[PDB]
Ligand binder design. Structure first.
Ligand SMILES: CCS(=O)(=O)N1CCC[C@@H]2CN3CCc4cc(OC)ccc4[C@@H]3C[C@@H]21
Length: 375
C-alpha cells in the first residue's frame, strides 16, 4: 500500500522496543528498591503495565492495518482490538487523574492522608480505576464500523462526545484543575521567603552600582530587615523539619551570620569607606548563597509532584489534538487521512516518552536504571 514498507515497520518495532524496555525498567526499579519506593508509586507500575500492554497488543495491529490494509482476522479481532485500545488510553488518563488527587490530598492533609495511604488502599484505587475504565470504554453494543470488517470504530454523532469526555476530557480537566491548585498553594507558601530573597538581591545590586555612603547604608539597613524576616521563614527543602533539626539550626545560624556581616558593613559605610562597604557586601552575598541557597530547593515530594506534572503535560500534549479533531468530525468537520492518523500516532508514542521523563527529571529512577544496566 506504501512505496516503502520496511522503514515504517522498523520504526514501529523501534517504538515498541522503547516502550517495553522503558516501562519494564520502571516496574523493576520500583519493585526492587529496598524501601526507596512508597506505595504511592504503585500507580507508576500500573501506568507502566498499561504502556507495555499498548505496545505488544495495540500498536502492532494498527501497524499491520496501515501497511497491509485493514485485514482484520475475524470479527473478534476488531472487537478486542478496539476495546483494549480505548481501555488503555482511558486507564492512563484516569490513572493520571487519581495520581493528581493523590498528590493533592497528600499536600492538603499530611498526617490524615498518610495514615490512609496504605498499600491496600492504593491497590483498591488501581483496581477501581481499571474497572471504571473498562466500563467507560465499553460502548452500548455499538462495537465497530465479518467478511472484510475493517477495524474502524463507529462514529455516532452522540457517542463520540460521550466516549471522549468520558476518557480524555473529564480526567484531564480534573487533573489540570487539581495541579493549578497545587501550583497556587506552593507559590503562596513560598511567597514571603521569595519576597525577602528578592529584596536582598535588589539591595545588593544597589550597593553594586552605588556611588555614595548614603545609598549603601540604606540598602544595608533594608537588607538587615529582610534577613531578619527571612530568618523566621521555613525554607522549601526544610518544609517537614523540626526546629531542633541540624538543617533548621543551620538555616537560622546562616541568617545570624548574614546579619552580623551586615552590621560590619554598616560600620564601614558610616565611616565613608564606600568601596570597603561594597566589598563587604559582595562577601556577605557569597556567604548568603553558600549558607541558604541549598535550602531554597524543593524537597523530594515537591520535585516528584513537578515530575508528575510534566508527565501530565506530556500526556495532554500527546492526546489533545487527536481527541480535538475526533470530536470536530462529529459536528461536521473535515480532516485529512494522513493528518488524522498522525494525530493519534502522537498519542501512541506517549507510552515510550513516559519512562524517559523519569530519567530526565528524577535522580532515583535514573540511578535505578543505571544500576540495572551496569550490573
Ligand atoms: C480508523 C478508525 S480509528 O481512527 O477510530 N482508529 C481505530 C484503530 C485504533 C486507532 C488508535 N486508537 C487510539 C485510541 C483511541 C481512543 C478513542 O477514544 C478514547 C478513540 C479512538 C482511538 C483510536 C482509534 C484509531
Amino acid at each position: 500500500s506504501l512505496q516503502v514498507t520496511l522503514t515504517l515497520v522498523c520504526l514501529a518495532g523501534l517504538l515498541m522496543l522503547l516502550t517495553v524496555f522503558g516501562n519494564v525498567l520502571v516496574i523493576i526499579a520500583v519493585f526492587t528498591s529496598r524501601a526507596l519506593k512508597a506505595p504511592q508509586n504503585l500507580f507508576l507500575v500500573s501506568l507502566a503495565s498499561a504502556d507495555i500492554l499498548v505496545a505488544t497488543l495495540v500498536i502492532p495491529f494498527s501497524l499491520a492495518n496501515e501497511v497491509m490494509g485493514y485485514w482484520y482476522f475475524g470479527k473478534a479481532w476488531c472487537e478486542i482490538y478496539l476495546a483494549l485500545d480505548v481501555l488503555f488510553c482511558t486507564s492512563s488518563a484516569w490513572h493520571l487523574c487519581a495520581i493528581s488527587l493523590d498528590r493533592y490530598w497528600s499536600i492538603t492533609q499530611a498526617i490524615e492522608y498518610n495514615l490512609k495511604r496504605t498499600p491496600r488502599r492504593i491497590k483498591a484505587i488501581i483496581i477501581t480505576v481499571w474497572v471504571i475504565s473498562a466500563v467507560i470504554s465499553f460502548p452500548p453494543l455499538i462495537s465497530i464500523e465479518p467478511a472484510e470488517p475493517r477495524c474502524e470504530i463507529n462514529d455516532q454523532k452522540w457517542y463520540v462526545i460521550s466516549s471522549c469526555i468520558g476518557s480524555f476530557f473529564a480526567p484531564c480537566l480534573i487533573m489540570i484543575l487539581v495541579y493549578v491548585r497545587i501550583y497556587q498553594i506552593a507559590k503562596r507558601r513560598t511567597a514571603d521567603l521569595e519576597d525577602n530573597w528578592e529584596t536582598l538581591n535588589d539591595n545588593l545590586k544597589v550597593i553594586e552600582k552605588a556611588d555614595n555612603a548614603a545609598q549603601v547604608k540604606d540598602a544595608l539597613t533594608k537588607m538587615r530587615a529582610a534577613a531578619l524576616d527571612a530568618q523566621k521563614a521555613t525554607p522549601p527543602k526544610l518544609e517537614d523539619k523540626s526546629p531542633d533539626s541540624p538543617e533548621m539550626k543551620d538555616f537560622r545560624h546562616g541568617f545570624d551570620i548574614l546579619v552580623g556581616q551586615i552590621d560590619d558593613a554598616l560600620k564601614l559605610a558610616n565611616e565613608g569607606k564606600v568601596k570597603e562597604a561594597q566589598a563587604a557586601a559582595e562577601q556577605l552575598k557569597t556567604t548568603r548563597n553558600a549558607y541558604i541557597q541549598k535550602y531554597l530547593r524543593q524537597n523530594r515530594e515537591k520535585r516528584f509532584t513537578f515530575v508528575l506534572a510534566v508527565v501530565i503535560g506530556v500526556f495532554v500534549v500527546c492526546w489533545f489534538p487527536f481527541f480535538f479533531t475526533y470530536t470536530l468530525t462529529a459536528v461536521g468537520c473535515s480532516v485529512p487521512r494522513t493528518l488524522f492518523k498522525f494525530f493519534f500516532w502522537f498519542g501512541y508514542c506517549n507510552s515510550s516518552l513516559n519512562p524517559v521523563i523519569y530519567t530526565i527529571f528524577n535522580h532515583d529512577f535514573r540511578r535505578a536504571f543505571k544500576k540495572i544496566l551496569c550490573r
